[PDB]
Amino acid sequence: MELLKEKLVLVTGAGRGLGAAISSGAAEQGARVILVDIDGTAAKAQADALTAKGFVAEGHALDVTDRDAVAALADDILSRFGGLDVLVNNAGVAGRAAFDQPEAVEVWDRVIGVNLEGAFNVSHALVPALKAAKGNVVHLCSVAGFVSGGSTAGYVVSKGAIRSLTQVMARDLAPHGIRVNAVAPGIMMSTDWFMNRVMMKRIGETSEVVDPVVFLASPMASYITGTILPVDGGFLAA
Amino acid sequence: MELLKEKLVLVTGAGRGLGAAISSGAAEQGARVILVDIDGTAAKAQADALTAKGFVAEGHALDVTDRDAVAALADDILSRFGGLDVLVNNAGVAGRAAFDQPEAVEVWDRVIGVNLEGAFNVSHALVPALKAAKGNVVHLCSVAGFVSGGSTAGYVVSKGAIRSLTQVMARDLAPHGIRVNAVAPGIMMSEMAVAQLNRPGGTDWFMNRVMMKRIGETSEVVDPVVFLASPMASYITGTILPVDGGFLAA
Amino acid sequence: MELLKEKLVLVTGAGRGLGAAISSGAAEQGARVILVDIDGTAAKAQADALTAKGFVAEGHALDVTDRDAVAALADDILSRFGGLDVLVNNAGVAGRAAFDQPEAVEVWDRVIGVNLEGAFNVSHALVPALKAAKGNVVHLCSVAGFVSGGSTAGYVVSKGAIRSLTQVMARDLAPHGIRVNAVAPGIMMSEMTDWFMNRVMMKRIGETSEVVDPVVFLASPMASYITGTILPVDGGFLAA
Amino acid sequence: MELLKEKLVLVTGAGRGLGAAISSGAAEQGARVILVDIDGTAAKAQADALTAKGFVAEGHALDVTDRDAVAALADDILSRFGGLDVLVNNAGVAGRAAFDQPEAVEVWDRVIGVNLEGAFNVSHALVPALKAAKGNVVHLCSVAGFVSGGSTAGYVVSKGAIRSLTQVMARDLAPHGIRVNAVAPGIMMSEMAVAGTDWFMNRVMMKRIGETSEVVDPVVFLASPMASYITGTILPVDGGFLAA
Ligand SMILES: NC(=O)c1ccc[n+]([C@@H]2O[C@H](COP(=O)([O-])OP(=O)(O)OC[C@H]3O[C@@H](n4cnc5c(N)ncnc54)[C@H](O)[C@@H]3O)[C@@H](O)[C@H]2O)c1
Ligand SMILES: NC(=O)c1ccc[n+]([C@@H]2O[C@H](COP(=O)([O-])OP(=O)(O)OC[C@H]3O[C@@H](n4cnc5c(N)ncnc54)[C@H](O)[C@@H]3O)[C@@H](O)[C@H]2O)c1
Ligand SMILES: NC(=O)c1ccc[n+]([C@@H]2O[C@H](COP(=O)([O-])OP(=O)(O)OC[C@H]3O[C@@H](n4cnc5c(N)ncnc54)[C@H](O)[C@@H]3O)[C@@H](O)[C@H]2O)c1
């Protein structure tokens, strides 16, 4: 399969977990991949492994909450490549705190900061590059963007906000030929609130979120925009 | 590129339009295809064109509202092939009638009968075959399953019913390894094929809101169906995927 | 409180359960109530109890799946009263069957027949009366109109269909001044578990009065800018 | 009608517009009302008009983006009253910017800051008082929390975030007897003047803008025992917009 053949793909949070798996899967589908993470060492380790397999890949440190660093990366991509075919906003954090605890404030600030504000930073900064290539954006949402589930308030809200960001980015960028979608994973390999309701009675394998991301990023989804696709084993239908 | 390699796919309403395109697209992805349509001659003409191109396909008449005929087809499939890998419930009709008109009743009965009751008939009858193969089901939902849009009451309700049917079939069939999903298209080009049936202004409800400002190509609805029916969707069930140019997000 | 002062309210399935409670609550809010049920003896018993309490009520047998009987009632209402201020489609049934069982077909036909086809029959037939009064409609949906929960396929589908019916009725009847809404209850005190209780935020079954109050609200001028809407009354179930 | 009889109700952004009208409508339903607004003179002016009509009300200046100011108010309410029966998070702002413009950043920050971060600030600070009274919360969401409509990105996102906040606050505060809900207005007469209207009007089935009192009534309903089995819920008050 070559669903992303010769496409330039940027994946944030690519040092481990789903982001690294999405980076590897995009390369397997023919993409050249830019892997970025707050842990630059991890991003470069993942990129060097792809390179060692004959893929075209590079890795860099990037804190998505640093608007100056995001702008620098955006200028760099535009200057070296002239555009960006796919942006995957995968960088995220979570936390543990009930709403009625003082701990909820610091957890809220941290999670909102990365999951929502960082996704806005990278999304807004990469618009010129996405315009030049008529690329598309895939956000990492969550089933927590539709129900509260068992995640902390900052996480639920950040993912509900990403759901809305998908819609309004799609609206504003559609005139420029840019599609914007999201996946909403349930629990993926990377607990009661999810297992009671997941129809498949199993957590997802990382490859099973990779394939829907690649689909949405590909011409198979060329009439799909503003859409959040559950990848959740039936969780939200239960 | 063979997402459905050697898989047996049954498509209803496959004699024309989107159903025929889903059938061809499945074959191009490696599937053996059973095409059925109320017009059996049309289903056979579509199947024969696939056979001439080297694919493996067959066509039959099927009235999805006839439970006896649906059961006969299911028994035939189980007996001849031992199972069914993909069911696509595409057969469907629409209509024009406002809720306050007497005409709304005949339209409602007809549309509910084909779109919802037919989809239930075919889905329920093929469960044994789907269990044997651990196959999956893709329903044809609609943007009208989420909002009223411009469609007649029977159509809106049939597609909202299909959305719920997706969820409860997914729940009850998950222990048998059967995924159940749906696509929710806006207007695609096959629905514009007959000119005299395109009333002036008739697509404004959709065109005024769709973000891409165009009717979808028929192949752009085929590809998401194939995706949902494939192992790329192996962790997706109970899910209804809009394929609508951004209509429902607007 | 007189949220439905002098309004005429028709409640289907009012012989017992939520329909009888909605009928009583509507009368308490000032309404004249027509109570109908396939069990006409129960409908008349509920109506006569309301009459004995000093309210204005009447009861009749009605099978909502019988289009001829539904039309006769709609004609009687238009002739005797000139219009209808509120229609509450509450009549409903349920059943038990998994989708892969042969029994699912009989359950499907029975449940679709009352819950969806019956609601269509009554809704469509009462449009002339609703237009004359600029009345409104409240359907009984369910949390099962949004997720599969633990209900049988025919029930789940019937309630998702009611959700859509709410939307397209609202669209077509808005130009005539008719609002159309629905409540989506969780599990209520009635003929009626873990699938719900593990998820309900309030960790209890709803009281019947707690579905009556939202129905009265939607039927009242408090909801004069609300149409096409389905209001969960579910202790938080759908938000969990 | 006394749906909120003797209940203490705090309304943010109550200096004008919907917040002022919710404050007045709550007082009409028997509530004692605390009105707060970044313009404290306006909040006190609205409170004094209610006091003149025989209701019990007070006004204060409050910037909902100032966490120390919010904490002081929460302390004052808890100390003086021992609890809070209703919190209405109404304070909000909007703005004009498309996502691909540089102006979208400053609009985003400003709108997120009031609409989402302020609603969080007030909601989290008032939890002790809400616990002591088993009060409830009504957020001001929007049809924009469900579809993109015509609003700027920061507004759409802030209201979808409010939608999710309703759900997770309801989950965490249900053990303490606190319901949390929201209304989702469409276009209402007020700052329908810095958006212009046709994105809402094309889809609004009633083909009219909602009157202010038609949003007040559903807010009062959700804040009252009529909604005692309703939590985590976002109620559209939109003329049919989201059903179209
Ligand atoms: N794993 C799941 O079950 C699941 C479910 C739903 C959604 N998601 C979403 O998938 C995405 C990835 O999840 P994961 O399980 O791989 O998480 P993970 O914590 O394993 O990986 C997150 C990655 O993002 C990076 N990161 C954190 N903060 C950053 C910042 N400021 N700038 C740049 N990079 C940063 C981390 O270094 C890490 O490499 C997240 O957005 C998460 O919310 C995951
Ligand atoms: N009780 C709950 O937990 C709950 C939850 C969600 C939704 N609902 C819905 O609320 C409505 C009332 O439920 P309930 O619990 O009071 O049920 P119930 O069975 O106690 O009452 C239903 C009433 O409808 C009548 N009825 C049945 N078939 C009829 C027909 N063909 N014509 C006329 N009347 C008929 C019955 O005789 C009965 O009086 C139903 O639509 C139900 O689906 C109930
Ligand atoms: N989305 C929609 O369709 C829609 C339409 C109208 C109103 N609304 C919502 O209703 C609410 C009220 O709207 P409105 O039309 O009355 O707005 P408005 O501009 O008329 O009034 C808003 C009030 O909030 C106050 N305020 C602003 N920033 C503040 C801060 N940092 N701290 C405290 N107070 C502050 C202002 O002083 C003002 O009095 C808002 O949340 C708004 O988003 C939504």
CSV table of N, CA and C in Angstrom, one decimal, chain B residues 89-170:
chain,number,residue,atom,x,y,z
B,89,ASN,N,-25.5,-3.0,3.0
B,89,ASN,CA,-27.0,-2.7,2.8
B,89,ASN,C,-27.1,-1.3,2.1
B,90,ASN,N,-27.1,-1.4,0.8
B,90,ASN,CA,-27.1,-0.1,0.0
B,90,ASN,C,-28.5,0.2,-0.6
B,91,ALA,N,-29.4,-0.9,-0.7
B,91,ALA,CA,-30.7,-0.7,-1.4
B,91,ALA,C,-31.5,0.4,-0.6
B,92,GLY,N,-32.0,1.3,-1.3
B,92,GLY,CA,-32.7,2.4,-0.7
B,92,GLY,C,-33.5,3.3,-1.7
B,93,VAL,N,-34.5,4.0,-1.2
B,93,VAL,CA,-35.3,4.9,-2.0
B,93,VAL,C,-35.5,6.1,-1.1
B,94,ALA,N,-35.9,7.2,-1.8
B,94,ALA,CA,-36.3,8.5,-1.2
B,94,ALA,C,-37.6,8.9,-1.7
B,95,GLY,N,-37.9,10.1,-1.6
B,95,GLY,CA,-39.3,10.6,-1.9
B,95,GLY,C,-39.4,12.1,-1.6
B,96,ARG,N,-40.5,12.7,-2.0
B,96,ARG,CA,-40.8,14.1,-1.7
B,96,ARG,C,-42.2,14.1,-1.2
B,97,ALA,N,-42.4,14.7,0.1
B,97,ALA,CA,-43.6,14.9,0.7
B,97,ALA,C,-43.4,15.6,2.0
B,98,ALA,N,-44.1,16.7,2.3
B,98,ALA,CA,-44.0,17.3,3.6
B,98,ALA,C,-44.9,16.6,4.6
B,99,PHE,N,-44.5,16.7,5.9
B,99,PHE,CA,-45.2,16.0,6.9
B,99,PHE,C,-46.7,16.3,7.0
B,100,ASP,N,-47.1,17.5,6.7
B,100,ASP,CA,-48.5,17.8,6.8
B,100,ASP,C,-49.3,17.5,5.5
B,101,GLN,N,-48.7,16.8,4.6
B,101,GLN,CA,-49.5,16.4,3.4
B,101,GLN,C,-50.0,15.0,3.5
B,102,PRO,N,-51.2,14.7,3.0
B,102,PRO,CA,-51.6,13.3,3.0
B,102,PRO,C,-50.7,12.4,2.3
B,103,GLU,N,-50.0,12.9,1.2
B,103,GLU,CA,-49.0,12.1,0.5
B,103,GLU,C,-47.9,11.6,1.4
B,104,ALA,N,-47.7,12.2,2.5
B,104,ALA,CA,-46.5,11.8,3.4
B,104,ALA,C,-46.7,10.3,3.8
B,105,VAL,N,-47.9,9.8,3.9
B,105,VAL,CA,-48.1,8.5,4.4
B,105,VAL,C,-47.6,7.4,3.4
B,106,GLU,N,-48.0,7.5,2.2
B,106,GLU,CA,-47.5,6.6,1.2
B,106,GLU,C,-46.0,6.6,1.0
B,107,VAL,N,-45.5,7.8,1.0
B,107,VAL,CA,-44.0,8.0,0.9
B,107,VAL,C,-43.3,7.3,2.1
B,108,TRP,N,-43.9,7.6,3.3
B,108,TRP,CA,-43.3,7.0,4.6
B,108,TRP,C,-43.3,5.5,4.5
B,109,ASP,N,-44.4,4.9,4.2
B,109,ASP,CA,-44.5,3.4,4.1
B,109,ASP,C,-43.5,2.9,3.2
B,110,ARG,N,-43.4,3.5,2.0
B,110,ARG,CA,-42.5,2.9,1.0
B,110,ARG,C,-41.0,3.1,1.4
B,111,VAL,N,-40.6,4.3,1.9
B,111,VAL,CA,-39.2,4.5,2.2
B,111,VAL,C,-38.8,3.7,3.5
B,112,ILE,N,-39.7,3.8,4.5
B,112,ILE,CA,-39.4,2.9,5.7
B,112,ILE,C,-39.3,1.5,5.3
B,113,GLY,N,-40.2,1.0,4.4
B,113,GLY,CA,-40.2,-0.4,4.0
B,113,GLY,C,-38.9,-0.8,3.4
B,114,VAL,N,-38.3,-0.1,2.5
B,114,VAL,CA,-37.1,-0.5,1.8
B,114,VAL,C,-35.9,-0.2,2.7
B,115,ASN,N,-35.8,1.1,3.2
B,115,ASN,CA,-34.5,1.5,3.8
B,115,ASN,C,-34.3,0.9,5.1
B,116,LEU,N,-35.3,0.8,6.0
B,116,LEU,CA,-35.2,0.3,7.3
B,116,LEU,C,-35.6,-1.1,7.4
B,117,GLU,N,-36.8,-1.5,7.0
B,117,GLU,CA,-37.3,-2.8,7.1
B,117,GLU,C,-36.5,-3.8,6.2
B,118,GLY,N,-36.1,-3.3,5.0
B,118,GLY,CA,-35.3,-4.1,4.1
B,118,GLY,C,-33.9,-4.4,4.7
B,119,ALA,N,-33.3,-3.3,5.2
B,119,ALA,CA,-32.0,-3.5,5.9
B,119,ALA,C,-32.0,-4.4,7.1
B,120,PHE,N,-33.1,-4.4,7.8
B,120,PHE,CA,-33.3,-5.3,8.9
B,120,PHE,C,-33.4,-6.8,8.4
B,121,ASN,N,-34.3,-6.9,7.4
B,121,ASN,CA,-34.5,-8.3,6.8
B,121,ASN,C,-33.1,-8.9,6.4
B,122,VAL,N,-32.4,-8.1,5.6
B,122,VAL,CA,-31.1,-8.7,5.0
B,122,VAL,C,-30.1,-8.9,6.1
B,123,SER,N,-30.0,-7.9,7.0
B,123,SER,CA,-29.0,-8.1,8.1
B,123,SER,C,-29.4,-9.3,9.0
B,124,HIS,N,-30.6,-9.4,9.4
B,124,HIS,CA,-31.0,-10.5,10.3
B,124,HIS,C,-30.8,-11.8,9.7
B,125,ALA,N,-31.2,-12.0,8.4
B,125,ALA,CA,-31.1,-13.2,7.7
B,125,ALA,C,-29.7,-13.7,7.5
B,126,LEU,N,-28.7,-12.7,7.2
B,126,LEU,CA,-27.4,-13.1,6.9
B,126,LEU,C,-26.5,-13.3,8.2
B,127,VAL,N,-27.0,-13.2,9.4
B,127,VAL,CA,-26.2,-13.4,10.6
B,127,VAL,C,-25.5,-14.7,10.6
B,128,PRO,N,-26.2,-15.9,10.4
B,128,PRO,CA,-25.5,-17.2,10.4
B,128,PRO,C,-24.3,-17.1,9.4
B,129,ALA,N,-24.5,-16.6,8.2
B,129,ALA,CA,-23.4,-16.6,7.2
B,129,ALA,C,-22.3,-15.7,7.7
B,130,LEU,N,-22.6,-14.5,8.3
B,130,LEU,CA,-21.6,-13.6,8.9
B,130,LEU,C,-20.9,-14.2,10.0
B,131,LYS,N,-21.6,-15.0,10.9
B,131,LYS,CA,-20.9,-15.6,12.0
B,131,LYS,C,-19.8,-16.6,11.5
B,132,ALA,N,-20.2,-17.4,10.5
B,132,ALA,CA,-19.3,-18.4,10.0
B,132,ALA,C,-18.0,-17.9,9.5
B,133,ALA,N,-18.0,-16.7,8.9
B,133,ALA,CA,-16.9,-16.1,8.2
B,133,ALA,C,-16.3,-15.0,9.1
B,134,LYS,N,-16.8,-14.7,10.2
B,134,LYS,CA,-16.5,-13.4,11.0
B,134,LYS,C,-16.4,-12.2,10.1
B,135,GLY,N,-17.5,-12.1,9.3
B,135,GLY,CA,-17.6,-11.0,8.4
B,135,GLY,C,-18.0,-9.7,9.1
B,136,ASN,N,-18.3,-8.7,8.2
B,136,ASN,CA,-18.7,-7.4,8.8
B,136,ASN,C,-19.8,-6.8,7.9
B,137,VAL,N,-20.5,-5.8,8.5
B,137,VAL,CA,-21.7,-5.2,7.8
B,137,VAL,C,-21.4,-3.7,7.7
B,138,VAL,N,-21.7,-3.1,6.6
B,138,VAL,CA,-21.6,-1.7,6.3
B,138,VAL,C,-23.0,-1.3,5.9
B,139,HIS,N,-23.7,-0.4,6.7
B,139,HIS,CA,-25.0,0.1,6.3
B,139,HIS,C,-24.8,1.4,5.5
B,140,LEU,N,-25.8,1.8,4.7
B,140,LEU,CA,-25.8,3.1,4.0
B,140,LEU,C,-26.7,3.9,4.9
B,141,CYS,N,-26.1,4.8,5.7
B,141,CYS,CA,-26.8,5.8,6.5
B,141,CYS,C,-26.9,7.1,5.6
B,142,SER,N,-26.9,8.2,6.2
B,142,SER,CA,-27.0,9.5,5.5
B,142,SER,C,-26.8,10.6,6.4
B,143,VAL,N,-26.4,11.8,5.9
B,143,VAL,CA,-26.4,13.0,6.7
B,143,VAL,C,-27.8,13.2,7.3
B,144,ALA,N,-28.9,12.7,6.6
B,144,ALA,CA,-30.2,12.8,7.1
B,144,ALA,C,-30.5,11.9,8.3
B,145,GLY,N,-29.6,11.0,8.7
B,145,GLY,CA,-29.7,10.3,9.9
B,145,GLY,C,-29.2,11.1,11.1
B,146,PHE,N,-28.7,12.4,10.9
B,146,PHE,CA,-28.2,13.2,12.0
B,146,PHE,C,-29.0,14.5,12.1
B,147,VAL,N,-29.5,15.0,11.0
B,147,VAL,CA,-30.3,16.3,11.0
B,147,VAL,C,-31.4,16.1,9.9
B,148,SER,N,-32.4,16.9,9.9
B,148,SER,CA,-33.5,16.7,9.0
B,148,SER,C,-33.1,17.1,7.6
B,149,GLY,N,-32.2,18.0,7.4
B,149,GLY,CA,-31.8,18.4,6.0
B,149,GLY,C,-33.0,18.7,5.1
B,150,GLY,N,-33.0,18.3,3.9
B,150,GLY,CA,-34.1,18.5,2.9
B,150,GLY,C,-34.9,17.3,2.6
B,151,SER,N,-34.7,16.2,3.3
B,151,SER,CA,-35.4,14.9,2.9
B,151,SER,C,-36.7,14.7,3.5
B,152,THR,N,-37.5,13.8,2.9
B,152,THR,CA,-38.9,13.6,3.4
B,152,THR,C,-38.8,12.8,4.7
B,153,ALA,N,-39.8,13.0,5.5
B,153,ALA,CA,-39.9,12.4,6.9
B,153,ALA,C,-39.5,10.9,6.8
B,154,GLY,N,-40.1,10.1,5.9
B,154,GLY,CA,-39.8,8.7,5.9
B,154,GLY,C,-38.3,8.4,5.7
B,155,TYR,N,-37.6,9.3,4.9
B,155,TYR,CA,-36.2,9.1,4.6
B,155,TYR,C,-35.4,9.5,5.8
B,156,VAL,N,-35.6,10.6,6.4
B,156,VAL,CA,-34.9,11.1,7.6
B,156,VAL,C,-35.0,10.0,8.7
B,157,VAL,N,-36.2,9.6,9.0
B,157,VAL,CA,-36.4,8.6,10.0
B,157,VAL,C,-35.8,7.3,9.7
B,158,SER,N,-35.9,6.8,8.4
B,158,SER,CA,-35.3,5.6,8.1
B,158,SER,C,-33.7,5.6,8.3
B,159,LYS,N,-33.1,6.8,8.1
B,159,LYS,CA,-31.7,6.8,8.2
B,159,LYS,C,-31.2,7.0,9.7
B,160,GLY,N,-32.0,7.8,10.5
B,160,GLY,CA,-31.8,7.8,11.9
B,160,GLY,C,-32.0,6.4,12.5
B,161,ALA,N,-33.0,5.7,12.0
B,161,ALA,CA,-33.1,4.3,12.5
B,161,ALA,C,-31.9,3.4,12.1
B,162,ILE,N,-31.4,3.6,10.9
B,162,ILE,CA,-30.2,2.9,10.5
B,162,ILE,C,-29.0,3.2,11.4
B,163,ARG,N,-28.9,4.4,11.8
B,163,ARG,CA,-27.8,4.8,12.7
B,163,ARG,C,-27.9,4.0,14.0
B,164,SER,N,-29.1,3.9,14.6
B,164,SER,CA,-29.3,3.1,15.8
B,164,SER,C,-29.2,1.6,15.5
B,165,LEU,N,-29.7,1.2,14.3
B,165,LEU,CA,-29.5,-0.2,14.0
B,165,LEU,C,-28.0,-0.6,14.0
B,166,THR,N,-27.2,0.3,13.5
B,166,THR,CA,-25.7,0.1,13.5
B,166,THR,C,-25.2,-0.2,14.9
B,167,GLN,N,-25.6,0.6,15.9
B,167,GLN,CA,-25.2,0.5,17.2
B,167,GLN,C,-25.6,-0.8,17.9
B,168,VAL,N,-26.9,-1.2,17.7
B,168,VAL,CA,-27.4,-2.4,18.4
B,168,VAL,C,-26.9,-3.7,17.7
B,169,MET,N,-26.8,-3.7,16.4
B,169,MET,CA,-26.2,-4.8,15.7
B,169,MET,C,-24.8,-5.0,16.2
B,170,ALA,N,-24.0,-3.9,16.2
B,170,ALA,CA,-22.6,-4.0,16.7
B,170,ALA,C,-22.6,-4.6,18.1
